[model samples]
Target chain A: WRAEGTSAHLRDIFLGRCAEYRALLSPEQRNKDCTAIWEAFKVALDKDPCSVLPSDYDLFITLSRHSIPRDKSLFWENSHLLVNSFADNTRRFMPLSDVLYGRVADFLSWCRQKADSGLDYQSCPTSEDCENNPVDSFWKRASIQYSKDSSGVIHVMLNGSEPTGAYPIKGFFADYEIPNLQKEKITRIEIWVMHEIGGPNVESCGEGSMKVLEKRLKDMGFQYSCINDYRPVKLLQCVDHSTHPDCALK
Target chain B: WRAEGTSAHLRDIFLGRCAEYRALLSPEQRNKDCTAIWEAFKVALDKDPCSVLPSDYDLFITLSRHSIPRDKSLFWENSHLLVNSFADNTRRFMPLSDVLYGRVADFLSWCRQKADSGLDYQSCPTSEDCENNPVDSFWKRASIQYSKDSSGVIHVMLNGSEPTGAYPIKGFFADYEIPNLQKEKITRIEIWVMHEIGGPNVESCGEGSMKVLEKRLKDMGFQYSCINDYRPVKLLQCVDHSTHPDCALK
Candidate 1:
């Protein structure tokens, strides 16, 4: 009872977004896609937040079919916000989520179950509950399909300023994206590492974790190249920090 | 040359075995197989033995096609003589050559151009001219087809006592056979490492370079198991060394 209003609000937001996306589909596709997404959503609606698995969203992902253009697919680790902002603003490369779900905002959206009644609208699952949660599952499933669908040259943006490393061995990109990258279909992967404007330059191409990633790629029979502070990605960062020292040098 | 007459003798041995094997094939298959084998042979016959490539035998391989029964395909490195003998004597697992060319002896057969006028009979291409030579090329082409045709469970026999390694990173097995093993069709690979009687036991399952082979298989997404001194292969070695210590242990 305490969470009834919140639950309704959450449901309304999800359905509204669904309808908005559905309107973009053909009449022939609208009903089928909408029904499948709703059915998949309902699987986790009343369930415990920690118990949901990626398989639960299998139908939803299938129904939300889309294709990323060759050489325009983008992958990232710890560089999500800037990567998506660049893709969204420039409309150059298509991130996995944008290809699958059609908008950047929808990817950040999440829902949770209420202890008393229906659902909680205020907060989403954290990394603690995120592994098997609906939102994380959706991204994992989408990332796999996106990698499989990608061909020719693809872009990967990583954060160079992370204390531990740039390319984390544990993340959505490492766990799902890299493994699912098809060998025969993909011709090459171009990796770019970007650091914060005034931050210490922690990693670069052919050094540290980036070198490890490059070796892994070659071992898997993929042609790969890495660059530190790639021009376009650095330019994107400059948009927010116009007066930064790195921007002047560029 | 003293070697001239011996080369002719070797050529006679190979063609005799080819005719012998052809008779075993159905009436419809005999002429087609014989003609294709001869044509492929001719590619190297008139040319320097060092110039032949595996691609030269492509048409011959296509013409001599035979199916390996599921779960009955065998692969071997450095244990060729014993492996083929076991397959021949028991009529159990079908060796790759048997599947590709209907007989194993032909895979070991070779011929070279005559120096003066007539075809030589006493010698064939050795390791000196084996690479890019007719015999090696035939086996390389045939090994590829054999691996591609194989499905379900497969077996591999390796010599465990080689000073260099059991599974050579070079040679026909690595270059042609392992690369051509189709991932989707094969259910499992069973590697049997055999050592000679009274020899220093060296390579085995999960030890030395054999471990490297196992990791390679897993990286290529195969389900595999390794065994040292596998019973069937060990028994085959005993046929020649009946009074050896290892034979008595069994």
Candidate 2:
């Protein structure tokens, strides 16, 4: 559950993220034109809660466009904690959220007011109103741009323990991201379906709903592969659980 | 001229160097074999300095042998201050003296006892007793071993302002170092002949005694090249003298 509080918290998050992002910019880049980003973000600030659209963040995305190096784009669903933890430790890959937000703020919730005032942090939308909310719309728009710009090999970490299915057919990945990927520019997609450390090994490659993912990739004319319990991911887990059974395997 | 002081000063320098070197070692390497070094060094402390030969310190060197990464060996004749300053600034090279002695006691004057009782730091040899002194012999022995073990492209910084010559024909480099260099193991030698800020510009490549150095390298069957006022070294000097003539040049 996201923190729903006074409007001051929302202002704090926005100003804090902006300052954090500015600190990361090079001297040459820091001086570049960024008034367009602030103006575009402010346009939707005083709008109704469920009225802000994904296109509202268009200018901010255009001004903040930067190239992601090859073999560094990481995507995940239901595996946010593990994926980000693994990327932080190995330093071999950088997730889209890291490149955009850079530890400033991520996966937090926020909303705007109907009157011509500032943000309304007291009452923000949940997953039910995901499409029209400001935070969700920003991630949706940013994810589309991130997918289009990504090149070389890309990695996606999905939770194999999800009861209904590992790869949800209606979530952000299936709806917003899959359609936006530049198939011609990308080399291939590597899917890692990881189970929890203990048990209940339900889904894996060539089993259960993972076949649907494979069929979907082929139907979309994209080259892809899927693996279960990848070595590096398991090795990372062993750091915290040295005596776990998975750690004892080769 | 070397400073002749109390025996306690010599002991301080020795213990201080050991502690400094230990701090630089990795945790795994710190636990490696090093006790033999102190024992060998201590064996000669109470012996007659005049009778203690270079071979007396051979055991210490044998126990201290470690890998020196290729293309990172930095050797200097008279540009010790500037060469080390540049290396420390850029972190591109590791000087032989830094690896052998660490930051404890490089370029400091030190000698051993002349009497059979104990170390006589109160009276020690200076440059007047250069060849036969214990301090000079240790460097002579160490430099020979350093040169032999080095591989790939090696960098040598020589002062172009010396009145006699840039590359002395009979000093440490010419006699002890050059003759001991493992010609087959090394790739090539890059000699940077740097002049001071305010200068007579007395010596450079193809002029003065630099020609003799080039000939010596070829005669030794090794590939070598010499440059006058190398750019990186000049850039380092510009840090101290921003308004110097070289700083203004392209």
- Name the candidate that leads on DockQ: 2
lDDT of each: 0.66, 0.66
Worst-scoring 10-residue span by lDDT in model 1 chain B: B1-10
Q: What is the DockQ of candidate 2?
A: 0.01
True contacts kept of 1: 0.00
- Clash number by candidate, in order: 10, 0
Specify the CAPRI tier of model 1. incorrect
lDDT per residue (tens digit) for residues B11-114 in model 2: 34444445435535556556423335656665645455544566777876776655667888877787777766556512457776666432323554445555
lDDT (Cα, tens digit) per residue for candidate 1, span A1-250: 1211223233333443454444344566655444456666667655666567777767666767665567888889887667755665225677764653434124344555546345666666666744566566667767787788888897899988988889998888888989999888788999989888788789878879998888999998899898887765565455445455554421
Looking at candidate 2 chain B, the ten consecutive residues that score lowest on lDDT are B5-14
Q: Determine the backbone clash count of candidate 1.
A: 10
- Per-chain TM-score of chain A in candidate 1 equals 0.82
TM-scores for the candidates: 0.44, 0.47
Superposed by TM-score, candidate 1 places the C-alpha of residue B199 at a distance from the truth, in angstroms, of 1.5
Candidate 2, chain A: TM-score against the reference: 0.85
